[PDB]
Amino acid sequence: MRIKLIIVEGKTDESFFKVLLEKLYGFREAKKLTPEFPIGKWGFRIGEHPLVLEKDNIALVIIHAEGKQRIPKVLKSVLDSVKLGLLNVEEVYVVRDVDEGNDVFEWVLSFLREREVRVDNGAIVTEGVKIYPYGMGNLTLNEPFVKEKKELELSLAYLAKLDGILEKYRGSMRALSQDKGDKLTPKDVMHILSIANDYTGDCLSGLYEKYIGIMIHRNRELLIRFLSEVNLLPLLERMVG
Amino acid sequence: MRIKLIIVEGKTDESFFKVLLEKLYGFREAKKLTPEFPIGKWGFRIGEHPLVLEKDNIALVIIHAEGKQRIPKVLKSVLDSVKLGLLNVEEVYVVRDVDEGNDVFEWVLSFLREREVRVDNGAIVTEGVKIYPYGMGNLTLNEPFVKEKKELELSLAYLAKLDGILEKYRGSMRALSQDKGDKLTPKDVMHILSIANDYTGDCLSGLYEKYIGIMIHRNRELLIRFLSEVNLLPLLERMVG
């Protein structure tokens, strides 16, 4: 079983990748397989249960709710384990909103200073492990009343744009911005999408699974186009590769 | 310790009650102590961790997402355990939106077959346990663009109104309605509230805790007045004390 580690910031990011990896690429959640990942090997806070997705001979272990000082501890433990051959991890993905801190590549690399690292095409190679940092939100969502914040919600907003949902409203975006007394954030648009799709769930993360889940069998070519225009296909291709 | 069981439908309902019970009545969440609730006595599902709030000599056990078909299963267990003297439960609260099914009183009553029953102060008494069936959302939200759906969100929408939020907007409500091609549901308004308060979290349940928790600090009387006009005070005062 090939082991890959995927690190995201929160539940919202986890769901986004989960619905794509399951519904589009055919991955499934691990069975009753609930092995207490030894904090001594992976370096994750006690009581944390990662999401394990599998397909064929590949196991994707996704984790979130890390922290600004936990990511480095996770990478250090895992890399310390691989060095001793204690883990089979062969690929590590680290994704975060572009508008967060400095560039994502420089960020990940600042944690690998004491390690021998060789670079390739978007891949950081160290100790036989390919590390793929990735910034979410590299695109331009051209909406008059929406602030240009590069993050997960900006991409999801663009998908709504292509789906024609932002045009179906617009009057609402204008009205909301007027009442708010400022331009809308991509997160506010996520709340407009909830109303537009008559979403009755508690969490936006749930909405992303529902919304993208239906588009896959409703207008699969549209979703593919979105993933391609936002530069998400190559990343996804690597995760399942 | 005196134990009271509170049964709600979902996380949103659990947060709403939790913020009031903690921030308004001084209740605190049970220590690290995680006393595995013996299913044989409570009738809860496998890996369920109910919220335990405590103060003085009263323990409030709140559960949600139990299942429309498991509620009676839970009641039977608890009631039988009380008859046998294995649980110190004296009151059980069952909260459900008015919208769903039939009258909450009949709904609960239909779960108590082969039980000697007696009604006292609107409560169903059996096995010495006071069962309080309560319908959430019993009020009239006078908003031309919002459907009259009696539920947790309708009450939340009313609190937003008293707070002057729905007024500050409305222009947005009008626009949202026009683009949607129908009146806004109370749950739709909840998303406008996220925008009006610049809520960045993933779940609306988290917004209720934040929004109410802060109100308790900036305008306590407004919340108390709200709780009174929606007739939530007598229920809360029963749960506590």
TrEMBL record, chains A, B:
Pfam families: DUF3226. Gene3D superfamilies: PH0156-like, PH0156-like domains. This is DUF4276 family protein. It comes from Pyrococcus horikoshii (strain ATCC 700860 / DSM 12428 / JCM 9974 / NBRC 100139 / OT-3).
